[PDB]
Design a protein around this ligand. Sequence first.
Ligand SMILES: [Cu+2]
Lengths: 1027, 322, 324
Amino acid sequence: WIIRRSVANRFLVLMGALFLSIWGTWTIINTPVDALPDLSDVQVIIKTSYPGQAPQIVENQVTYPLTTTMLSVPGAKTVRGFSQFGDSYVYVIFEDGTDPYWARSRVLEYLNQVQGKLPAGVSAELGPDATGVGWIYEYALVDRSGKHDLADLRSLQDWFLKYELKTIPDVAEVASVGGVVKEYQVVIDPQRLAQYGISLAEVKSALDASNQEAGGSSIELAEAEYMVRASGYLQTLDDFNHIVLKASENGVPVYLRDVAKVQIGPEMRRGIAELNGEGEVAGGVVILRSGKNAREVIAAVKDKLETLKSSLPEGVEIVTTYDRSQLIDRAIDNLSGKLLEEFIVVAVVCALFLWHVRSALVAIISLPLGLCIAFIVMHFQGLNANIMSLGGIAIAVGAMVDAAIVMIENAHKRLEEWQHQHPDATLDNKTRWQVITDASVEVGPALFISLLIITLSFIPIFTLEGQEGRLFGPLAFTKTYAMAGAALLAIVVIPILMGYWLNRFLIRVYHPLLLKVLHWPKTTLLVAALSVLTVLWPLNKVGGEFLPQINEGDLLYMPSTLPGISAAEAASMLQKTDKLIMSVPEVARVFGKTGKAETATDSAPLEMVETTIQLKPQEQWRPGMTMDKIIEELDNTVRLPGLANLWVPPIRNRIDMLSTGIKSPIGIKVSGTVLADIDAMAEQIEEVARTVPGVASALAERLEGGRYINVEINREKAARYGMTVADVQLFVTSAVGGAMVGETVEGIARYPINLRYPQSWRDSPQALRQLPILTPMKQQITLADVADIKVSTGPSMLKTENARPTSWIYIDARDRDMVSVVHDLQKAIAEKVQLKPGTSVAFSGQFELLERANHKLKLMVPMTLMIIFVLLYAFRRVGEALLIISSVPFALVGGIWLLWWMGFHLSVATGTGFIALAGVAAEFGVVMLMYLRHAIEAVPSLNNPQTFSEQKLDEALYHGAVLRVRPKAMTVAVIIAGLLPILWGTGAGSEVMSRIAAPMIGGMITAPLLSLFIIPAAYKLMWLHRH
Amino acid sequence: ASGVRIDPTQTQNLGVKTATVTRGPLTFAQSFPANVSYNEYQYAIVQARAAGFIDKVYPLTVGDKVQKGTPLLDLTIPDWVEAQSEYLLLRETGGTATQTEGILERLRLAGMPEADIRRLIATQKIQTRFTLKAPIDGVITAFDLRAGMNIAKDNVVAKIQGMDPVWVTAAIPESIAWLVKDASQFTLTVPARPDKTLTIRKWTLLPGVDAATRTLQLRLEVDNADEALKPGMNAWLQLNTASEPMLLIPSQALIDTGSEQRVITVDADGRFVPKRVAVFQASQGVTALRSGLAEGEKVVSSGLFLIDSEANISGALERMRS
Amino acid sequence: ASGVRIDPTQTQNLGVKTATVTRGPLTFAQSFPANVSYNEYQYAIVQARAAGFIDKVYPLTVGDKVQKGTPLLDLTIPDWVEAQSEYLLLRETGGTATQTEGILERLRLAGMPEADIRRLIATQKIQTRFTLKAPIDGVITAFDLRAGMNIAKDNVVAKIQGMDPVWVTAAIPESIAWLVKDASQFTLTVPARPDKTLTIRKWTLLPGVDAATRTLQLRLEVDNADEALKPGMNAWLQLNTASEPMLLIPSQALIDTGSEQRVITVDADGRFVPKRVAVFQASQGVTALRSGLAEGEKVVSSGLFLIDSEANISGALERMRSES
Ligand SMILES: [Cu+2]
């Protein structure tokens, strides 16, 4: 119907399509790419920093009144709270669908009220607008000229770089990593305090009342307004020294100089950064706003650095340590390459079963405007996101051209009839118009119905909830697009571009075995069905990950150790590790990192290390080298005692923590209300994961491995010296601990100032016990005199997931598939570990994300069968519709057997594939069920629906065979060919392209090679029922 | 089963500022707090040689300035009449020359001033009313006798101390006792009078230090003909000088635990090497060393290689060697 | 089998260092503040022997240094004139020597200084004016007599305090009393004079504690002929003290989790094996075990954390506890 309206408006629409085409080629240009918009977002981070060093009340309380409030906030669900050495992390969570900022605006209702109950000096800080996945571009500042040092470089970062980059749009936070913060250290000699009769408290105060400015209003002179202003800012070491502590009637004072030494020095260090195992360095890291564009930002950054070449001081070098573009491009280049190779293959298939320059051209033109239409609808979803958008336009390039070529063939031989009946020496414009219409009438309807069905069989992917859904969501859309559009172009354009403008030795290879399928119809039907049983058996060879392990050039090394390591030690362990990693010939750069960075997005403790390894381009590796083989050398070369090392890709990591929390692919979590119970379950589990042959290393982080030095103040004792419990603590918070006490205001910079006894006095449980104390009544005592001090063990870091304690168990498998490992893991747990009181076990990582995808699939096949049935009844007949569904499973049978030969697994990439395999069935049913109907609708069909003569429909079906092969074989040729590229595993993201492909590869070869005999030989058995 | 080795010792090739052990002087530029005060070698405490009652007291009081000879008060002293009579009556009958010389020198020992005994011989009359005058120029800082009172021998009738050469005393911090002992010249200044600023070249440094503060006492005398510098005024004593040449390294370069002090030396190749050092004293950003380094050695200027709020100073240094 | 084997090329990369156990005494070291003070055995408080009146007062004040012999003031003492006169009288008229001496004695226990009685017999002249001089080298710290005054037989004319064998007294907190034994070694050091190397003559732990500051009193007599050590100066007293003999290991090599405390022994085979020790005390970088080891035994003192971890993970620690 609508195709006639098309030939009516011959010109116009075509020109519109080529306009929608160039509009398509721009609906893309907002391109770069997102390797991943795969992040969860129903979480707002709240980071309270250094209220006090007490991993039992500081983060019992910040996880107490502060989370009790996050129990009160609307949209409330679960209030988890990391709670560590003076740092408090809290992650609020929501319903999946919720709008990002909606969440924040609610979380923000009780961050304010609560702010007041925090001690002085701590601010409960809200996370950034971005997530962990947003870590785009990292870099270390270096200088080999020795003209600068860590102190200067870090300051170069905090007060120049960070401010220059944070400006660039779409960036959410330029965090600092590693480096040294300049600190003004007031080292108070406890002996001076006594000798000069000045108390610690007096010093703290004296220092406070001497570091600020004052306004004195204005004062009009000469009718002008003169602004009175007073100095007072500390900015010379001398100024420190000349802080007055007391003065005589003589006017002879005692300065801070007389009881202390003011020395510049490194502040405390939260995390350490190291480069190439040859030097500790200062770093920055650009975090990208939640939604915005990765590459666009990246590129805008690079140019902003070249604007800083005449800007940086002599000797300073930015050595870049991580770059998302390198992958993003390597991924968009490969997929572009394929869209070009699959285009040429069809131009050599539509030209191999059609010998006419203007015959291949037509089918060829079906692509540029079909590619562009894809680009259009690639704006409704934006192809800014993913290979899947491009991969989905590469996965269905085979069927997009199918729609045209098939029509073309129904025209070819439809011309071989009007030339044999009518003459040959007289043809006008009307005659060609009439054959084009005839060609469009018989193969017309059938073709469309099909392409509706395929998009319907695909619909059930929209319902896939989460990261997997986002992974094949664009693909689920970008396929329903160029296909539902090519069906629109082919019905309003294609025909007009074909009007305006050895196949023997394959028909002889076919039909000889065809006439044999009729020896007995039903018996040939069974011997083919038993080929389904042969697929069920070898279901038992391959496995199934959640997602094909996509490999970026960058590589994340995350070794974990027992919970107690010291900063100094871990920083060393880091440089040790960095030197080994660097020794492996394939690595180019190594950017280590213990602790965290100046970002709310980093909770990692010191005993954990993230080291980011870039390997020199593949064009420079050793002879027989491979990623999976490099990682193996790395795991053997890099290894120290008591240090499990886990190897994980840069991206997968942050995301993996944003979805479940785990850092590794394998993840066991043991959440318990008690503490001793969870750590107990954690160790037992840890031990069985080592025995399993499918493990490279296993270690469950601890919770209660913290080491403490207790100062139990004795009220009664202290009382004797007139000291309150607080009076003594000042020697803990400031004398022993070097608590901050102020900041020097240096222009656009701010550096900390602090009091402390010289190291020696606070060296050990012995030193602490002999801490000299100058009491209020000027008595000279020692800390022990007013408190016992014992060494003890306790919470290393309280952890919670949903307000209930828990410990993550990290496991690393890579030599053996996942599903085979995970199943054994929870089968070794229940059979050996035994069930302890109240302590629930469960899994995580990728497995947890795999279980969410599997579910709904039993509603993804019937929701396709409930909608496929509706589509099967373009033929109206029910008994005919049932056949289709049974001719499809055999096509599935092919997708499996090829997984085996390729050595692939059962992912949701393959899962998607198989559904797009049945998406071909409907079309397949249309190509032959229309031919079969026709043969028994044609002039020999006044021979069958009248009487009986078996040798009559045997010629109508033999003719339906020679008619299908030509248009059908060519349609298969394009698929097999577009099947190969996706099958290849060379390139960035080609593996994942393969897993989502092979399901269709074998799947398509088995349908033609099967449903060419089975579809017909089942109709020669249903006609023989009505009669 | 790998056998690839690696160097464990901490390493740094990406940012290490190094200074070179030079040899030179510690310089100083300080201003000590000082006070203007009475000269203590100009001290007069007047008190009667005998008991008596006060007749009159001249218009003085504490705080007033007096010149030598200024009458203070008149008093009647009877302790001397008995013996004075003796001398007189002795002349009425022409006693021996020595008989007189005797009684007359008994009066001296008696306490009776010499200038009052002459008034005994000249007038030949008994002397009962005497006048006490200020013995020296100066300021009256005590005055315990008024009209109507009796006068005991221990009462002070006047504490007269002078300012002729007025005194100034600076309070120098013990810390630089090693330097001020061999000092050469200070510059005195007093905010009360911005033109009386002169260069002090002679001064005595007292052998005791105030303990309340811990400061040395440097006492110098300034001429005060005009009476400009008034005792009780604030003054400043400044000291600009350099020390005897010693080993000098940047103060930043010294890693001092509470008990052990040392520096990170950079060797002939590029390896770090912690060496113990002996300190003398620092000043204006540089510390002199008593011993430990060789003039010209390389040394890094950082404790910035040992995260403050952790690491064991001892332990962190060890990781840098072997 | 206890302990745990570790790939020798991993511990080599770790940079594992090891120290050797040994028996000996632990030397405690602790610092204390001290004041430089005057010497109280160099103490003279000049007081006139008789009453008179000040004739002249020399250029001196409190704070000035004086030597033995320095004139302080002149005074006229009448009290002795009679006796003297009576003595000179009998000298004229030849009285027995038993009579003469029997007068110079009345002169002596009257008060008149021996030297002025000598000046008498030497000149045969009545002595009326006298000069009090400084009986020792020292520092005037009191001076209540100025020109124009009468002198009472109880006014302090000069309080002179000496300081050559100067005193330095450190203050130890009562709780730490035990740190100071007889064997204890001491080292003085004054900040005011970084260039002086002090020599302690003798040191004493004083009978009682200064109830004011709850500190014991340790007084040292210290050479000071250059007079560089001024009274009032700050002085830091560093003390060393040896304990009874004990097993000795580096402190960097002992793990203390409160409940237990252990060290990692390096076996003969290079097999790291944990062992429980009982600590006794620790000071200046070394801790003394009361028991648990045997001299000669090797003890890891670097990379200890990780190695202990590995040992904990390998169950090496869980083993150690059940075996004994
Ligand atoms: Cu991590």
